[PDB]
Nucleic acid binder design. Structure first.
Ligand SMILES: [Mg+2]
Ligand SMILES: [Zn+2]
Ligand SMILES: [Zn+2]
Length: 900
DNA sequence: GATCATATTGTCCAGACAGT
DNA sequence: ACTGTCTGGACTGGTCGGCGCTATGATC
RNA sequence: UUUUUUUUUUUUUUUUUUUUGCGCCGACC
């Protein structure tokens, strides 16, 4: 059968294990000869694997691409210290007797630590603290309790140098260098019983194994060799490092065999130690990194695992995948929110493997007969034996007549297929959702507009990735869990995320506003466009010139369910006295007459009774993101499919309404009368006079300092407050003369796009430009620009733009606005990286937490983090405004349903 | 004029550490 | 027991494409 | 007129079915 990995046990490889697992001994530094054949005994020996296609492995007998590679070994002439175990070696040497070999602890202390180790074993932090305490206790001891032999302090010098402070005959203290052979001999005397006290395992990690005597050379598959376009081989950095190691080891062995003096032996030993240390880690502190001939700092085994481009993050936690596509996205309101537009070229390339069954034999046979060049067709066919056959014109008929039950047909992407649609960066779980394939002739992806806010995607050149699941389990998981309609409500705040946007909101406002009426032709056309299942028109609301007319509220009410009742205040409510009468009428009777409601109907108060929009207008509070009460109620009380249908119908209806009525903005939308401009100029002049008076008072010393601040900050705060008040007054003056008939004002007030402040800047004035919360000061001595006098603290000299976008900015005001915009762009480009790093840290901290079947949240070890998730066991996605149950809404809905 | 060994050894935050 | 100092580390994801670079000195 | 060496049977053919890495620069979202 098949087996899976249950657990992984780590340790230090013994020299005997390295020798036994080795397939060959490497002694020749050279890799390839002049003819290009591998050299026997070299680093590219065929016993370690094969890279070239024509080569055959002497250990496996297989060809390139399927030989896994085999490890070698190098017999070092002298032992060397592993740089990754240097601190542990120093700690163990400090914590152990030099000649006796036992740990410098009493028997009672050893027993006490042995019993304490069993109690604290689950938490690795407790074990680390116990190890540190044992090391600290054993370090201060200068006499071994087991034998009474005197001890000397051991000094550790980076990277792998150990100094022993021995005492001379006259009492002088001199440093004695401990060679790796002496260190290994000292480590060999430690018994197995003291190893748990030192944090080592008797059978897995012996202390003497931390001093390397046999170096395992990696297989050639781990360090592949390529050839360039000019025929010159490009060896890996590990290959060059191993070449240097082999050369130095051979030179050291030859010098040892030649009886060289000890001075040469120490130099060669140090060179070999440096080479081994750089091979293990080329970024070790205090070590000059190994450099290539061209000057390139080589990357080694340590660099291949850590970092963004390491083995873990770059190849294990994340990697490139097959059956994926990426292209520019384009809007498509005609498709549903559950659908994605797939190009025909993309569909004809990406394939889904479908097994031949009894109920789909004819379809797959037709797909095979069509071939790869005829849509809908197939590209590959897999027999039950498991081999893959490519489909072409010559053999498409032979395969088609040979098709049977159990075959696999890699047909092209068809309508209704489930694929993954993703936009980067993936900040939340809504960044990847499963859509339905819709095949289109052009070369762009198509995404429905309400699905843009979950992706945070616009259409100014955005590109998105498409993934096609290949297994039945993955397809089922995508279809059940990751469908678009299943994630309308955002789990972050428990509100709508897949909601209407600017044009939908504007069209809804245009349709549902007071005085909006449509002819029979317009109503029928918008009903056909929206796909609503309406066969007969309702009774006309009024007649004009002998022609029937339908109110927009009547057309909008066809979308709502017949048993839906809700009332609230939208963003268009500017006269609360009109909403108060409606609220009192609703409260008094709880079933108000529809004629009575329409008599005192107000656009700012939306009231839906039994699915009929009796009052109010559609805005961002209707079905907008994070504010749509109607959409949120529809999701919670009618399911996700009904909500998806409602969204698909209402988006098309509002799009038709806004398209044929005519929505536009012009240069006269920001126009203001002369009296408004005069008032704005008067406000600006008054603010400038106030700033000048404050400056004069500060110069005369009459300014009262604020608590906790000196005169300069007090004056700056007063000036900024005055300028902000002036900007607010100018904005109010501009808002006074901009009525509801303005399309830009409609867009700002309905929440479709933009703000009132955006219209204020173009109409009245820009205001004060500031960076880092302070007025502009960077420039010359005492002045931002030379055009102003030195020492001028006035508003105009510090970044107060009196002009507006329509009036035209002065060059100084242009420079100030450029400073502000640069500050904003820099702030965004700096904040993004910190936010991403914090998100990665949080993800890695809370990756393993999940809710068990009993409602508890536990770590993989088993420690209970929460006895109930959220202390109430309620999903934030299904929570009503952060609460457990919306009691008032339930009571009101039940009472209305039973009394209606 | 062809080949062959050899080719060098950037601020900030947090934990550990001499000094008083 | 505090306090300033030395040392280690990580530096948001994806995508697009381009542009170089991967021997040399001394015999026989 | 003289010592201290030993001896024997069971394993077959002329040969065979797919550019990695390094660093830089610009740019999109
Ligand atoms: Mg964009
Ligand atoms: Zn092999
Ligand atoms: Zn001892």
């Amino acid at each position: 059968m098949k087996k899976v990995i249950g657990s992984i046990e780590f340790g230090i490889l013994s020299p005997q294990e390295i020798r036994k697992m080795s397939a060959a001994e490497i002694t020749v530094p050279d890799t390839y000869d002049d003819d290009g054949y591998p050299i026997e005994g070299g680093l590219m020996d065929k016993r370690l694997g094969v890279i070239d296609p024509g080569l055959r492995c002497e250990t496996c007998g297989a060809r390139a691409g399927e030989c896994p590679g085999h490890f070698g070994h190098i017999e070092l002439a002298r032992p060397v210290i592993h740089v990754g175990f240097a601190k542990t070696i120093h700690r163990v040497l400090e914590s152990t007797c030099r000649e006796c070999g036992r740990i410098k602890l009493t028997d009672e202390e050893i027993e006490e630590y042995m019993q304490k180790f069993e109690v604290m074993g689950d938490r690795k932090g407790a074990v680390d603290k116990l190890i540190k305490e044992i090391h600290k206790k054993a370090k201060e001891r200068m006499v071994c309790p087991h034998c009474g032999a005197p001890q000397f302090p051991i000094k550790f010098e980076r990277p792998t140098i150990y100094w022993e402070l021995r005492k001379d005959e006259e009492g002088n203290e001199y440093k004695h260098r401990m060679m790796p052979s002496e260190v290994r001999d000292r480590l060999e005397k430690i018994p197995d019983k003291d190893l748990p006290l030192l944090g080592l395992h008797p059978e897995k990690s012996r202390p003497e194994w931390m001093v390397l005597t046999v170096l395992p050379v990696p297989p050639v598959t781990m360090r592949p060799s390529i050839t360039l376009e000019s025929g010159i081989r490009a060896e890996d950095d590990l290959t060059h490092k191993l070449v240097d190691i082999i050369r130095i080891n051979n030179r050291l062995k030859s010098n040892i065999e030649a009886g060289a003096p000890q001075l040469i032996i120490e130099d060669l030993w140090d060179l070999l130690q440096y080479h081994v240390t750089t091979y293990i880690n080329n970024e070790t502190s205090g070590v000059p990194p190994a450099k290539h001939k061209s000057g390139r700092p080589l990357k080694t085994l340590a660099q291949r695992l850590k970092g963004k481009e390491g083995r873990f993050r770059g190849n294990l936690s994340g990697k490139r995948v097959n059956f994926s596509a990426r292209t520019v996205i384009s809007p498509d309101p005609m498709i549903s929110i559950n659908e994605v537009g797939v190009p025909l070229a993309v569909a004809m390339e990406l394939t889904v493997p479908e097994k031949v069954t009894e109920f789909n034999y004819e379809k797959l046979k037709q797909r095979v007969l069509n071939g790869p060049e005829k849509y809908p067709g197939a590209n590959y066919v897999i027999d039950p034996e498991g081999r893959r056959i490519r489909l072409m014109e010559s053999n498409r008929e032979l395969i088609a007549e040979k098709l049977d039950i159990g075959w696999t047909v890699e047909r092209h992407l068809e309508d209704g297929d489930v694929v993954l649609f993703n936009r980067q960066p993936s900040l939340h779980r809504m960044s990847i959702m499963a859509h339905r394939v819709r095949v289109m002739p052009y070369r762009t992806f198509r995404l429905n507009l309400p699905v843009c806010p979950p992706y945070n995607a616009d259409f100014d050149g955005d590109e998105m990735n498409l993934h096609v699941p290949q297994t039945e389990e993955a397809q089922a998981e995508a279809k059940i869990l990751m469908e678009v309609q299943n994630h309308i409500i955002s789990p972050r705040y428990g509100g709508p995320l897949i909601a209407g946007i600017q044009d939908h909101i504007s069209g809804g406002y245009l349709l549902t506003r007071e005085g909006a009426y449509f002819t029979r032709y317009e109503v029928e056309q918008m009903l056909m466009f929206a796909g609503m299942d309406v066969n007969e028109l309702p009774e006309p609301d009024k007649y004009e010139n002998g022609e029937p007319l339908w109110s927009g509220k009547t057309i909008f009410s066809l979308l709502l369910p017949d048993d839906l009742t809700i009332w609230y205040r939208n963003k268009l409510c500017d006269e609360p006295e009109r909403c108060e009468a409606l609220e009192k009428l609703i409260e008094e009777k709880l079933i108000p007459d529809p004629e009575e409601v329409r008599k005192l109907a107000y656009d700012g108060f939306v009231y839906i009774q039994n699915g009929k929009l009796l009052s109010g207008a559609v805005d961002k509070k209707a079905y907008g993101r994070e504010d749509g009460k109607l959409l949120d109620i529809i999701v919670r009380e009618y399911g996700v499919e009904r909500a998806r249908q409602f969204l698909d119908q209402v988006t098309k209806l509002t799009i038709w309404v806004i398209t044929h009525k005519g929505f536009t903005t012009a240069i006269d939308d920001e126009d203001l009368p002369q009296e408004a401009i005069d008032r704005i100029h008067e406000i600006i002049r008054e603010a400038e006079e106030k700033v000048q008076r404050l400056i004069e008072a500060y110069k005369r010393g009459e300014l009262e300092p604020l608590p906790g601040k000196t005169l300069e900050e007090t004056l700056e705060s007063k000036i900024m407050a005055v300028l902000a008040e002036a900007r607010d007054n100018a904005g109010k003056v501009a808002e006074r003369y901009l009525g509801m008939n303005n399309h830009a004002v409609i867009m700002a007030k309905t929440g479709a796009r933009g703000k009132i402040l955006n219209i204020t800047q173009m109409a009245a004035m820009l205001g004060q430009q500031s960076i880092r919360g302070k007025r502009l000061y960077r420039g010359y001595r005492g002045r931002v620009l030379t055009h102003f006098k030195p020492g001028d603290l006035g508003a105009r000299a510090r970044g107060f733009v009196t002009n507006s976008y329509k009036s035209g900015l002065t060059p100084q005001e242009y420079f100030f606005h450029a400073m502000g915009g640069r500050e904003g762009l820099v702030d965004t480009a700096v904040r993004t990286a910190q936010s991403g790093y914090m998100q990665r840290r949080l993800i890695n901290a809370l990756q393993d937490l999940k809710v068990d079947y009993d409602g508890t949240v536990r770590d993989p070890t088993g420690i209970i983090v929460q006895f109930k998730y959220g202390e109430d066991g309620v999903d934030p996605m299904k929570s009503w405004q952060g609460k457990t149950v919306d009691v008032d809404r339930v009571i009101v809905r039940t009472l209305l349903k039973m009394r209606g």
